[PDB]
Amino acid sequence: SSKATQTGAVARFAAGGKFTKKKDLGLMAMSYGYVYVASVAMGASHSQLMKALIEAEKYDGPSLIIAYAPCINHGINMTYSQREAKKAVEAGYWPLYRYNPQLAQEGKNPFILDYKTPTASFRDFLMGEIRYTSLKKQFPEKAEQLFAKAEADAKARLEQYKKLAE
Amino acid sequence: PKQTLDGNTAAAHVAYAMSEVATIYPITPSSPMAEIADEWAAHGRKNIFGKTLQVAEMQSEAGAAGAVHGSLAAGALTTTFTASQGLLLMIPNMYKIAGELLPCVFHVAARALSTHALSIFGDHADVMAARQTGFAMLSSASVQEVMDLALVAHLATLKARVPFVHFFDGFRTSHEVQKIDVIEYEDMAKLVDWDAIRAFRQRALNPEHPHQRGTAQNPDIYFQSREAANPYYLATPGIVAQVMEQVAGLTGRHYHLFDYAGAPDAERVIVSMGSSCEVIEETVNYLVEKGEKVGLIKVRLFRPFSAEHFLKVLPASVKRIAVLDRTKEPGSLGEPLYEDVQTVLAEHGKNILVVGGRYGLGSKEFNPSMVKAVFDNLAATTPKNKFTVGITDDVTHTSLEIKEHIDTSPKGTFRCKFFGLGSDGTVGANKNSIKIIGDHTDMYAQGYFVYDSKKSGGVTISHLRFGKQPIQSAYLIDQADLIACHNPSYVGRYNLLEGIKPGGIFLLNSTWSAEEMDSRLPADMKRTIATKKLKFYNIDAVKIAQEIGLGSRINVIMQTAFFKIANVIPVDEAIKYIKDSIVKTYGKKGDKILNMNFAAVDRALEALEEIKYPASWADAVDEAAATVTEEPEFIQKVLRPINALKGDELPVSTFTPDGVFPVGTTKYEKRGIAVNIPQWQPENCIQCNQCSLVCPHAAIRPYLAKPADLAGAPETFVTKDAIGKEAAGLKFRIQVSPLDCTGCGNCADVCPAKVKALTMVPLEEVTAVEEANYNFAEQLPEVKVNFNPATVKGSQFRQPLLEFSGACAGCGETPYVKLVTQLFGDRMIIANATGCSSIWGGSAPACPYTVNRQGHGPAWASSLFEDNAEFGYGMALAVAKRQDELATAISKALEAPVSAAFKAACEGWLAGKDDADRSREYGDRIKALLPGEISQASGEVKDLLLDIDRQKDYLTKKSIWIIGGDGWAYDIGYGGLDHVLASGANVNVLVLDTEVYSNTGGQSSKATQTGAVARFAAGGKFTKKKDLGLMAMSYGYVYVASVAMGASHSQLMKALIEAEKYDGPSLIIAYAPCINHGINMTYSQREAKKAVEAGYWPLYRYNPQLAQEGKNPFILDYKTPTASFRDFLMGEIRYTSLKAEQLFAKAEADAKARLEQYKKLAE
């Protein structure tokens, strides 16, 4: 288990599923204002990853790139590892944004939300990985409660990023 | 040139010249090294590379160590300064830096490790904990050796590629001032192996000739790869030896891996390390001259231990050796140096009886008499092994007997002691006096300064020595030629004239005439003055300072009096040197301030009066001591002797084996240090108790009493009718504790009455009256009152469980903690981080946390600086486990044949065990029924009840409080604090945010705002304040609140109660004004009011429970500021010293963007 582990995900030291939600490392780094922060996922958008890597390196200051990296511990077909990262962003599970402090110096909004409206089902993405389906096989009565919290937390996270962009 | 420096400055002098980068984190007593290096860089001092040193402060010593590793691997010569707990956190990277063979020098002011207790003082425990990292280890025994061996370490590490720990005894050498030969940077550069530097650059990480380092290795090659560095360790002794020859040719001072001193045909030899070598050599000279065949081996290079270099300096006549270790490894067969000496002698078949002992732990005194005791044990028929020196071990009988007292001080050495008051200028003047004597005579000069645990009004004792011979006396003065007492209150309180030589000088600051001497001086002092035929001089320095206009500052006056009588230098020459130093100190203060200090010198010369005492003073007799009051055993046997400066006489059997102390012991101190105390005006008082709320020492409280309880009251115990429906028919009085009051004046400033109901009057004028008043108010019986504790007035009728601490006058921290104990102190446990709150909260032997009439009060524990959040988190797990064990036994009682009332209280407790009020209500019911229920039971049922009684201290739900400063919460402990808040545990975190490192003198933190000037931010902090509250809000389920007592009492009350009742993690960030801000501590509450009114400090509350109720969790308690932001910065010295304008504009822009962001979260 890690603080980056999401709600309901089953890992070691989280046998009954992780109750607390994912720690938002990107949100805390944006609180400084002068740190370039970006959330990327290669399987979701090739051009958005190109945009963040070049902006972060050219920024004369600290840069933070949080990249979604599919793993064998997720319990997925690694043949479609790139596709699994695309389903994560399309389901609202992983955000794509860029926080550019240089835009603030130009009088513009530093936060740019690169993916605003998700089109895929959040629960359907969870059922496609063993690290979430093993919770439904262990405790069925408690799995529905954790999956509902994970989707409610992801919508509150999406509403927060829309507020930072608006 | 010759300069008077301390060990820290001597070490930084060489480290600065030899290094490009210095990544640091402050820790006593090593932080002065990083402070002076930062100052030198700020003024553009150039190193041997023609550049200024880059000083970078990290979040911890772990972060510093990693930065050292990265800087070294990327091609920069890098150093750092650390000690004690800081050195421990660097140990993981030390394995890497040695494993990668990177040249480096860690400068360590060796300090004890925190075991049964914290100790900021010196021993080798920290360095010994790293002796297996692969670092070389080089020990300096004096300030001169710190200068020389620092250069040796920097030169040797480049050649050997083995990094060095260069360490010297904390305080005993790091803070000892000495006149030494300072090595010029230009001479250092002439000895540097520049080829070795260039080869270091070629090995650097670089994309144009890249390499890989730090791989992971399997069992097949790891062992071989680890032994491949053996040639570098085999060559390091010879390399260090050759570098010592370079320094010898430059300076004339000859060092070796091991040095010998003493008789060439000695039979008894001491092997030792650090400043003890100075004390031992001085003793050896004295004993050898008396014919004893004794000697000393000084260990310079402890690692790598070169057997060849040790045996070469060991005389063939040696039959017995005593090894002295300044550390303790409990359960070990022997301490490290003893095991090395025993091993090497066995490997070479030497038939020498070897014995090991321990000394000087936590800066324990180690003087020549102790050295002889070690030599005498070597002369016994059966020498005691595994011994101790400097203590009386009456439990395990390890201590050596100090048979006789010897004086090994070289003849012609002048010795002076100065008893001063905290921040009265005595220490500063003595440092200037040492600089004067060192700079203008051929004499060696030495200074050592003993400080107090009390931050204001403490005792300081200066020890100064001057002589024609080098001063090796790394110990306190035994026989003084001159003793100065700069505070007349010490007369009759401390043994001032102890050990003064016959015919010596006693200089006193007092208003007493020669005739009043008979009545004011104690009999023992008069006996010493007469029998030893002392030259007794007196001076009314306060009178001089008042008439000139210097107030009560006597530093210049008392320094002038010293040179006038000491006969150290020509009096005319001294007057010039003093006035020259006055120009250096007061030249920027103005023309008027200058001539006043000039007049202080002139008037001090004429006011010094010799006291012609009668010879019959020698026969004076002590007065009959009054019938002392029966005090508790701990107070009588421990607290009083320690406060009497006699704690060294306490044997081992005095102390607990685990460092556990009683609570509520500060009430026996009664220091009585206030110049003015608040006098209560009953006619102007509206009975609001705000004065009791803001008192940083709980010295002023309200008292209620039924009119019958005012029977034996003194005539001066004037009371008033009690206002309020709860206190109908009662009397009210605001009473101050005169001996516990500090005279800060916060209560008079907070008093909101039309005419002030509290007026500051001198203590001495009203002390006799108010002592009788306080003694009656304190003995008043308890009064059951139904005042609402959620109000300011109602909370102050609750007993404060934090009282009379050692915090400064007007401290902005203790009122917060005092208020928490008044709300939940009955049932709270405190995990306190290292810092100010741990110093005034837990400095032995006095505990400011106390109990109520039932004996209940906060249990207090301090673990480390970095672990406090996890420390309290562990407490929460344990308390929950203990309540679960209690709940299991109570559920079994429901199945037992017990009374119906017992089952009723048990079911009520089981349903409300997690509610504070309900668990106390039904918990107290069970406690009332237990003695009768056990009497009516027998057999196994009686045992079931006895198990409930055994655990009855867990019926009431506990309140875990994690208290610490901003340096802990924002920097070194932030990673742990973040995890504990994310865990969701029911803990309450209280961050006393002073925006600086208050304990260590005021170093920079992430809580420091833009433009604020602190240590390690000499030019002002550029980056803005890190928003700890905003990051904790990102979790959503963490209660976060920003409070400031001086700004809003009700907002502070609201946030504290909401945070504690919240079933989850709570974070309270409290604005705590501090003396380091540079403001008048009388108006400490008022400064917090201007902070919120100027937009400098926000007031908000983030309640996760509001989100479940459909409401907005973020509430902005202060939306529109009315004061100017720029004007608030102008009210504190920490911002005015920058004048610079660019930082003030940046600070105001950050405050507007932070306020506008809080408006967005609320809208």
Ligand SMILES: Cc1ncc(C[n+]2csc(CCOP(=O)(O)OP(=O)(O)O)c2C)c(N)n1
């Ligand atoms: C690992 C470690 N590093 C450094 C220290 C020295 N040290 C103790 S408290 C402290 C600073 C305290 O700052 P803060 O947390 O803000 O408390 P304050 O004194 O301001 O109330 C320092 C540098 C230590 N005890 N342990």
Ligand code: SF4
């Ligand atoms: S002057 Fe200061 S220490 Fe004394 S009672 Fe008032 S607030 Fe307390």
Ligand code: SF4
């Ligand atoms: S602050 Fe003034 S009016 Fe209020 S209780 Fe104290 S003395 Fe009385």
Ligand code: SF4
């Ligand atoms: S926080 Fe400041 S005022 Fe309080 S005890 Fe520490 S140094 Fe003194």
Ligand SMILES: [Mg+2]
């Ligand atoms: Mg602080």
